[PDB]
């Protein structure tokens, strides 16, 4: 019977949707995602900003963005080295915005940053001490993506 | 056409089920699962026993349980900190049982443990050195889940 | 209904196929896979060569094979301890071939290796320092699987 097979197929598809959802949960858990918190992942590869941005988006995430000290600390722990943050002032010099929209609020600028040094610096990296430095978007820094809570 | 379409979709589904099964195997492997051994994993987050139980159960797992000295060590090195074990004596004081049912067989209690200190201590935690301590279930310890061998 | 349901189910299947691809990409990413580079994974378990092969085949990969100094170091950094390479002279004594077929193109043999020492040595392990030594395929070494770029 055609309808019986179709009904079975529906059940099979729904069963797969739930198993996949579980696979995703377990992987996030195994990757250190904390309950009700965003999770950060890195392959430890250094690349220019646009490449990090393209990579994270492909994975359905975004370049990591610290919204407070806890998150900033978590990103630093994950990155282990200087990494790009999802913050830039490429649209209008001086006004840093999140790659996902909106003006930068919480910050952790290193002493004397941001300074748009020399020919210009429109991207931001969280350096080893967790402090921030605006740098050239063309420099290669560790790719770190964040995924929703 | 409908009979063929349906037949070909069922085949697609079977391939996808196998592919998902592969993803699960590769993930466990990457997370250090040893052949014929249970898979222990943690996100490194500390919480009350009731939560770890709910969390592990949501991932189709249970709170880690050392059935012998080998598994007890395996759990210790995964947790890195004091983690809840799937054992409590909430039913009969002194009679510790696994959350999955059954009487406690292997144990690695610390000197003077269990002591059911203060108002009571019905949960168990494997402390840093692998030794056990009975502790209040309302306290917050590392969440470590186990998955079948 | 029937054809509408069937059309929806094809859409459901394709959507699920994309989500799973996404899941695999994110896992490879978290597993340290760099762009355009093959990647290596290990559960850190020691086992005879035949088991490494079986395990990697089940994961749809192959035993790690270094094609150049770049990959040789990458394999060594993942294994951390001596691991089997997908290279053996089992078919014809003295003729080292890749498990995937073909004669060696790159080699980092430690001085005086390979020597088929004593009762015989047909497998190869990358020692902690990257050099190669032919050893017994019966010995238990770290399993490192290789996945395509
Ligand atoms: Ca500018
Ligand atoms: Ca600027
Ligand atoms: Ca600067
Ligand atoms: Ca009690
Ligand atoms: Ca008690
Ligand atoms: Ca106690
Ligand atoms: Ca031989
Ligand atoms: Ca030989
Ligand atoms: Ca030798
Ligand atoms: Cl720039
Ligand atoms: Cl208690
Ligand atoms: Cl041999």
Curated annotation (Swiss-Prot), chains A, B, C:
GO cellular component, as recorded: collagen trimer; extracellular space; multivesicular body
Gene Ontology biological process terms from the UniProt entry: complement activation, classical pathway; complement activation, lectin pathway; defense response to Gram-positive bacterium; killing by host of symbiont cells; positive regulation of phagocytosis; protein homotrimerization; surfactant homeostasis
Disulfide bonds: 56-145, 123-137
Protein keywords: Calcium, Collagen, Complement activation lectin pathway, Complement pathway, Disulfide bond, Glycoprotein, Hydroxylation, Immunity, Innate immunity, Lectin, Mannose-binding, Metal-binding, Repeat, Secreted, Signal
Cellular compartment(s): Secreted
Organism: Rattus norvegicus
Domain notes: The helical collagen-like domains from three protein chains assemble into a coiled coil and mediate trimerization.
Role this protein plays: Calcium-dependent lectin. Plays a role in the innate immune response by binding mannose, fucose and N-acetylglucosamine moieties on different microorganisms and mediating activation of the lectin complement pathway. Binds to late apoptotic cells, as well as to apoptotic blebs and to necrotic cells, but not to early apoptotic cells, facilitating their uptake by macrophages.
Spans annotated as Calcium-dependent carbohydrate binding: 113-121
UniProt keyword annotation of Methyltransferase present: no
GO molecular-function term, one example from the UniProt record: oligosaccharide binding
Tissue: Detected in blood serum (at protein level).
Post-translational modification: Hydroxylated on lysine and proline residues within the collagen-like domain. O-glycosylated. O-linked glycans on hydroxylysine residues consist of Glc-Gal disaccharides bound to the oxygen atom of post-translationally added hydroxyl groups.
Residues bound to Ca(2+) 2: 113, 115, 121, 133-134
Keyword Disulfide bond: yes
Residue span, C-type lectin domain: 54-149
Name of the featured protein: Mannose-binding protein A
Residues that hold Ca(2+) 1 according to the record: 89, 93, 116, 121-122
Complexes and interactors: Homotrimer. Forms higher oligomeric complexes formed by the association of two, three or more homotrimers. Oligomerization occurs in the endoplasmic reticulum. Interacts with MASP1 and MASP2.
């Amino acid at each position: 019977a055609i309808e019986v097979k179709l009904a079975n197929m529906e059940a099979e598809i729904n069963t797969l949707k739930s198993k996949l959802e579980l696979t995703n949960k377990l992987h996030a858990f195994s990757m250190g995602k904390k309950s009700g918190k965003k999770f950060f992942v890195t392959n430890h590869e250094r690349m220019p900003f646009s490449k990090v941005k393209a990579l994270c988006s492909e994975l359905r995430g975004t370049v990591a963005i610290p919204r407070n000290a806890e998150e900033n600390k978590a990103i630093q722990e994950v990155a282990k080295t200087s990494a790009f943050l999802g913050i830039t002032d490429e649209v209008t010099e001086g006004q840093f915005m999140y790659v996902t929209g909106g003006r930068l609020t919480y910050s952790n600028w290193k002493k004397d940053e941001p300074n748009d040094h020399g020919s210009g610096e429109d991207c931001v990296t969280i350096v080893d001490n967790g402090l921030w430095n605006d740098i050239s978007c063309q420099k290669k820094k560790t790719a770190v993506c964040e995924f929703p809570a």
